[PDB]
Design a protein around this ligand. Structure first.
Ligand SMILES: Cc1c(C(=O)C2=C(O)CCCC2=O)ccc2c1c(=O)n(Cc1ccccc1)c(=O)n2C
Ligand SMILES: Cc1c(C(=O)C2=C(O)CCCC2=O)ccc2c1c(=O)n(Cc1ccccc1)c(=O)n2C
Ligand SMILES: [Co+2]
Ligand SMILES: [Co+2]
Lengths: 380, 380
């Protein structure tokens, strides 16, 4: 069931902003490891004495990497005469963020029709304001409320090139890499208590629980057309294996986002390209499933994927789940940085054509039991 | 003239340690951009709850990348029961360093016969102690004194695998990249006043001024066999163009190291490999000289390099200087990180065979006037 209770008009995921201490080095690692292009910058070259910001794009996916300069560069400035292109930025908050959390996402941004309305309605509905609505160059409105931990939900709205004050990267500095990734599918937070976190963010968005049929307990909030998908996990204590959610909270110094799931139009090409670059600057992937997993996949998705295709999934380590309505292909990278905190999921969904409806196939929770049982079988 | 006034027995450059906020991402960018191998680690996987440290190697060159974890991970520890593998490390100093300076080198390490002697003699001769001598696993001794800014000179000495507590990276995680780079040639500091900085570090090392035949004023300190080369610059104010030294001090928040010069056994192969990767995660190079430069190189090094070779230098943008005793091939990357601070120089030296004697060819100071005049000619 979908009550379509969105309290304001939301469109799509717009961009993800990482806060780091050196934007250049994270951005170039990410661009090579993921096949994202260098498309827009805001930094000293563009008259910004406050922060360094570099945008990577693959299809509709927008990764923003931001780090502070020395405050001495902008010490004469005040907020009305700032040279920062993102007005919510703050040296102290950014430096506090990176040194408390290590590398991670500071903002999950969604495009809305009216970011000032979206902010007002949100705050009026219990959201903790983080940055008030600012109109950039009479063209773009930007507002931030608190989401969880030190992560903020960022509303952007356009009257009619990323943001005012970003210049387009000169073609000789922009190499057209592409491994297949096309858009952000979902962004997942880890919190210590799911209940209050659910009722807080559902309370100011009007997002509804998405029907989702060892480790955690979770639930997924979804906008009206279920294209903005915001899962949230909490740990399940007292087990035998320590919950990854609890390890996350311990190493992250509290609540934050666990993973970004990126949609590829061809998860097979994507993972071939990403695996080729794993050990030369790219990303590592979590260990593969035991062949007992793939020896049981023919019994479950043999109607969706052929024998050659299922064997292909065995090569790249791709996991496969399926809904009552769709099939899901997924795989998890190792953590993106020093700490065992944030990671990336590559996915592709099969089915639910009307366009594809959001969340087709679910989120892979079955692959936990498919993995445990598959481990037992291989042990033999 | 070489008085050989070293006050203790120094061997070679041993390693360079970068302090950052995320070691993983800087290390992987550096390894791809420079062709260095992932050879040793100390981190959570190795029982180190204090800091994450990853060593990259190309020939004899050792780049160490270190970042702090959350202090909460090691809050029960005291200095005698620490799990840090580098005992001089300090969460507060590291976080203060990265947030004051951005990405940069924290330590220039040199191997000595006796690091405890080297420390004692040094401090007794005016060096400001930074970390006292610690004997690691009855095998390695490590000591630090202050060099300039927040950069420390690091003495290491071996009785007879990098340091105790680093494990060797498993071969499947270690891809044998190599673009030709073989050793560190020199490490250069920018300070606000050369005089006091020279007399301070020459005072506790006994290093002598190396005979070196617009922008800065510099001088080079050298050990007995002139293989540990420590140039130092200060700005030349009141000019027309703002000194790069002064820009460095402004954006770095004070004194620090300006550049690392890495020796390649084949600067032509190195720069082809590095340029191939510039726009896909590697390093950019400073803009090339006007062809008027290369149209005048035949008049100067036509005895050392052939017509095909000089044209090759024109392709990769390599500059060429020469001593009274040797020839120098060199080129400068763009800054390694967000700030216009530290950068890397690739070099190869021709001549002075006895082995090659250190510093053969000088350091390229002529290429300033060769560049200005070459610009004037091309302007025409
Ligand atoms: C992250 C994730 C998801 C899913 O994406 C997420 C929630 O599960 C549910 C709510 C939102 C939804 O998006 C699904 C399956 C997963 C993983 C995952 O990280 N791993 C790695 C791992 C295995 C053992 C120990 C530690 C880690 C898996 O094996 N499976 C099977
Ligand atoms: C760094 C360096 C060196 C040399 O290595 C260093 C000192 O000069 C002297 C002491 C130690 C010695 O190692 C030599 C030549 C250089 C550069 C250099 O960075 N550039 C870039 C640039 C050009 C215009 C404006 C800003 C930067 C050059 O053009 N030339 C020619
Ligand atoms: Co997911
Ligand atoms: Co140099």
């Amino acid at each position: 069931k979908n009550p379509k209770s969105d309290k304001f008009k939301v469109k799509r995921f717009h961009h993800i902003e990482f806060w780091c201490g050196d934007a250049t080095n994270v951005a170039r690692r990410f661009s090579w490891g993921l096949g994202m292009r260098f498309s827009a910058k805001s930094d000293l070259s563009t008259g910004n004495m406050v922060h360094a910001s570099y945008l990577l794009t693959s299809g509709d996916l927008r990764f923003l990497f931001t780090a502070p300069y020395s405050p001495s560069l902008s010490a004469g400035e005040i907020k009305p005469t700032t040279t920062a292109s993102i007005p919510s930025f703050d040296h102290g908050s950014c430096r506090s963020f990176f040194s408390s959390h290590g590398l991670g996402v500071r903002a999950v941004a969604i495009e809305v029709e009216d970011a000032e309305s979206a902010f007002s309605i949100s705050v009026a509905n219990g959201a903790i304001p983080s940055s008030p609505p600012i109109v950039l160059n009479e063209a773009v409105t930007i507002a931030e409320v608190k989401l969880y931990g030190d992560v903020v939900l960022r509303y952007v709205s356009y009257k009619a090139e990323f943001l005012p004050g970003f210049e387009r990267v000169e073609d000789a500095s922009s190499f057209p890499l592409d491994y297949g990734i096309r858009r952000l599918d979902h962004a997942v937070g880890n919190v210590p208590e799911l209940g209050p976190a659910l009722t807080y963010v559902a309370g100011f968005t009007g997002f509804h629980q998405f029907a989702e049929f060892s480790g955690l307990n979770s639930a997924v909030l979804a906008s009206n057309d279920e294209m903005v998908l915001l899962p949230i996990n909490e740990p399940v204590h007292g087990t035998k294996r320590k919950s990854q959610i609890q390890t996350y909270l311990e190493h992250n110094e509290g609540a934050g986002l666990q993973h970004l799931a990126l949609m590829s139009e061809d998860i097979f090409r994507t993972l071939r390209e990403m695996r080729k670059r794993s050990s030369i600057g790219g990303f590592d992937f979590m260990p593969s499933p035991p062949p007992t997993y793939y020896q049981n996949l023919k019994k479950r998705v043999g109607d969706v994927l052929s024998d050659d295709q299922i064997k292909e999934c065995e090569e790249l380590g791709i996991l496969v789940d399926r809904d009552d309505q769709g099939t899901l292909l997924q795989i998890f990278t190792k953590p993106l940085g020093d700490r065992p905190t944030i990671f990336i999921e590559i996915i592709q969904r099969v089915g639910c054509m009307m366009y594809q409806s959001g969340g087709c196939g679910g989120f892979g929770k079955g692959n936990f039991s498919e993995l445990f049982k598959s481990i037992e079988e291989y042990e033999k």
